[model samples]
Target: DLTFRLLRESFADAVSWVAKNLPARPAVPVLSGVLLTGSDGLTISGFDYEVSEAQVGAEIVSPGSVLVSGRLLSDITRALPNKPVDVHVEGNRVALTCGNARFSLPTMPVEDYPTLPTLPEETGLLPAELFAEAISQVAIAAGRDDTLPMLTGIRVEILGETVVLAATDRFRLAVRELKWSASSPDIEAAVLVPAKTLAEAAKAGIGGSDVRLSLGTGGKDGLLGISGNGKRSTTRLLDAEFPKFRQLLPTEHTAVATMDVAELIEAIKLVALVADRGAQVRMEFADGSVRLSAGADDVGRAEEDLVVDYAGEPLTIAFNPTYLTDGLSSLRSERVSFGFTTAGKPALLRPVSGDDRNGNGPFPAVSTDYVYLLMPVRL
Candidate 1:
């Protein structure tokens, strides 16, 4: 029999991470269980769509492996009274004991689980904070449609010192750039991963520690790995080509305004409350102020006008309420620089350290590292 001892805290924490990350509604029955292995150390893993495995702390007596249902176990482990847990395993089932309580659980075929790898090829290293920040910056715009691979994929192009990210749903496009310690100074390549995979990988690793990234290690161009916080997560990188997003970004604008991000986000929220479902939030700029209006139905309507340091000609635009709020939430700077050419063409939103309207000298002039281009709906 395979036996191991773990306190409730360690047992619950480790099991919960694995279970929490399991596919919400997986198709495969076997993949619904967690594969716990007591080898050189205590390791727990679960995979179906993407692989996630972690080495955790535990008291060991003999090396063993077992596959048990995760969703139920996640609940059972937490319900047990505060104490250590002893788990004994046979081929087809396992036994759990904690604080005078005992229960037997059926196990899946351990041999069926795919072998989760260790330390795949090293691509580069990034501070988890910067990595996550850069990720969330574009995460909002990455499409949720999960189709064509290209539209749903987040393009991470590592060019020497700078890494450029491009994501789009055709209507809503985004970009974010930052630096990382590449395996080589001239690291010139790109990786396309599904939006969910990228976000989850980043989401799971954010507690602390540097995130070690590896791509196509040893010339295997399909799978990628990111390790952090005693956990290693891996996923598939799409081979499909990414759309040419750069051309979709605006080159110049007839009017650019700098305004407080605080007021804008608040106003957008208030107006969205009264807006019809899936309706566009209309923006009109004039006399050094921008007016926000929404709601097409007779049920309700809302409007707000905020003063902005406007320049050039005044312009008005319309955008999806959710899309606009998503774009605004990612901005870190106190002020946002708004660029517009027409109500029909796509508009630009840039985080201004301080008046990015002039700092960047016209839209896309700096294209230095980051750019966000959100398409405007016909007003």
Candidate 2:
């Protein structure tokens, strides 16, 4: 007989984490089951072909192992009343009892489940809050089109203590930089990880103070491992090559504009309300302000003037409203700066630190730590 007792919350957390990562429609039914093994303690693990996850630190009373439906276990644990959960395995069935509620679940063949992959060597450590923030800042720009797999991933590059995360969907690109404690100060490598997976893992690590990152050899055989808060996940790296994005950044710009981020966001929202599909939100920047306008000869036309500090001759630019809003919302600073060379070329948006005083002055220097490049729509 296999028996164990675990805190309801602890068991629920572990089961929930593993179940969320399990493949919704696994090719093999056993692949959807979570393997629970109790020895010194208990470990709950789930593995699909592309990803594997495991959580440890559950209380144990007996040494044994069994595989149970991942989703079912999560649901039952969450619904159970606040109390210790007792689990027992007998033959091909697993029984769970908490308070007056008792339920039995049929166990899957443990022999059918594939072995979980070993976590790669730890490459670096980063503050969990910083990692989660950086991932969210760049992940918003990742492509949603599944047909092009490479664009759907965040390109993570590590150089010395500097870590850079970048994502692009052909129309826009976002890049964020932060420092981490690397295993070696001279280490350098790059990996393409699925943006959705990385985002989810980062969110899970938020409660912990630190997050550990592991990287395999870069290429088709690559694997990325992330762990924090007693949970770990491994995902297969993308095989497609990411674009040479560094060369796309402008070395110089003919115009620059700085404005309050919140004000600009609100203005864009109002102007975008009149914008139709493929419609461009026009922006005309001069000495002291920017004029935003959208929709003409169709539904309705709307325009707003936002005060800004502009440098260079008056220029007019237009951009996809949705893309523009996404870029602005990702910025964390109170003020945002825009660098442009012409109305037809890609423009840069960056967060800046300064007060929005007079609308006219020298433009704030662009922040290199986080930059967003948005392709302008031809008017």
- Candidates in order have lDDT scores of 0.77, 0.82
Candidate 1 lDDT over residue span 1-379, tens digit each: 5789888887777776666567755435677888888875588888867877767778777888888887878889878898989898855778899989998998777777777765567888889988888887787787777556678878988887688888888887789989888786477778887778778777663245688787733234777787766677777888888888877777787778778888898988888887777678888888779999988658687889998988766677889877877777787777777778778888788787764434334444345355667888887
TM-score of each predicted structure versus truth: 0.91, 0.91
Worst 10 residues of 2 by lDDT: 356-365
**Which residue pairs collide in model 2, if any?**
none
Q: In terms of TM-score, how similar is model 2 to the real structure?
A: 0.91
RMSD per model, one decimal: 2.7, 2.8
Residues 1-379 of candidate 2 have per-residue lDDT tens digits of 6788878888887777766666576435787788888878678888774554555566677778898887778889889898988998978899898989889899888778788787787888888889988998999999989899989999999888899999999999999999998886476888899988888776663246898888733322468888777778888888888998889888767778888988988898889888876478999987899999998776898999999888877999999988888898888888888988889899999888776432233333454799999999887
